[PDB]
Amino acid sequence: GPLGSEQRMFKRVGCGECAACQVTEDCGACSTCLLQLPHDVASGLFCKCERRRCLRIVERS
């Protein structure tokens, strides 16, 4: 951006660097994200693509 590419506050957003934070959906190649039931009837479930989890968690708000 015009004021740089650094973030002063990660508002529920990824590091912007690692693959996982580039990925937005289930990559379709994790033992877990293969278990993505499209007929979801809840609002939670930690059973999701582990390539949504930052490989270098540094965006802690």
UniProtKB/Swiss-Prot annotation:
> Where in or outside the cell?
Nucleus; Nucleus matrix; Nucleus speckle; Chromosome
Specify which residues bind Zn(2+) 2 according to the UniProt entry for this protein. Answer: C27, C30, C33, C49
Modification after translation (UniProt):
Sumoylated, sumoylation may increase interaction with ATF7IP.
**Which segments does the record annotate as CXXC-type zinc fingers?**
8-55
Superkingdom to which the source organism belongs: Eukaryota
Q: What tissue expression does the UniProt record report for this protein?
A: Widely expressed.
Annotated Zn(2+) 1 binding sites: C15, C18, C21, C54
Q: Kindly summarize what the UniProt induction comment says about this protein's expression.
A: Up-regulated by interferon.
State what this protein does: Transcriptional repressor that binds CpG islands in promoters where the DNA is methylated at position 5 of cytosine within CpG dinucleotides. Binding is abolished by the presence of 7-mG that is produced by DNA damage by methylmethanesulfonate (MMS). Acts as transcriptional repressor and plays a role in gene silencing by recruiting ATF7IP, which in turn recruits factors such as the histone methyltransferase SETDB1. Probably forms a complex with SETDB1 and ATF7IP that represses transcription and couples DNA methylation and histone 'Lys-9' trimethylation.
Q: What is known of its domains?
A: The methyl-CpG-binding domain (MBD) functions both in binding to methylated DNA and in protein interactions.
Subunit field text: Interacts with OASL, ATF7IP, ATF7IP2 and BAHD1. Binds CHAF1A and the SUV39H1-CBX5 complex via the MBD domain. Binds MGP via the TRD domain. May be part of the MeCP1 complex.
Q: What is this protein called?
A: Methyl-CpG-binding domain protein 1
**Source organism:** Homo sapiens
